[PDB]
Swiss-Prot record:
The RNAP catalytic core consists of 2 alpha, 1 beta, 1 beta' and 1 omega subunit. When a sigma factor is associated with the core the holoenzyme is formed, which can initiate transcription. This is DNA-directed RNA polymerase subunit beta'. Belongs to the RNA polymerase beta' chain family. DNA-dependent RNA polymerase catalyzes the transcription of DNA into RNA using the four ribonucleoside triphosphates as substrates. It comes from Thermus thermophilus (strain ATCC 27634 / DSM 579 / HB8).
Length: 97
């Protein structure tokens, strides 16, 4: 159905590189670019897939979870989401043999 999952991962909108900032009542992450960048608020214990300073494709997931295909489609394009969907569906079937 292409529904946006409840426990949704947060993906990077552009190319850039990361830097963490973990204070008590907020933990925001920035994918800084050779031009300008955006800031990604998220709840603190949310798990990361980005080592600080690492380099990220556009649509590469930063938190872990399901990926809203639409967020993916605008960022990375048709073939990219076409990929995700096929694989993400097979994972389910494989797991029941």
């Amino acid at each position: 159905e292409a529904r946006r999952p409840k426990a949704k991962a947060v993906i990077s909108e552009i190319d850039g590189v990361v830097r963490i900032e973990e204070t008590e009542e907020k933990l925001s992450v920035f994918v800084e670019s050779e031009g300008f960048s955006k800031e990604y608020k998220l709840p603190k214990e949310a798990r990361l897939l980005v080592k600080d300073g690492d380099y990220v494709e556009a649509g590469q997931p930063l938190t872990r979870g399901a990926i809203d295909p639409h967020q993916l489609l605008e960022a990375k394009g048709p073939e990219a989401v076409e990929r995700y969907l096929v694989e993400e569906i097979q994972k389910v079937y494989r797991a029941q043999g």
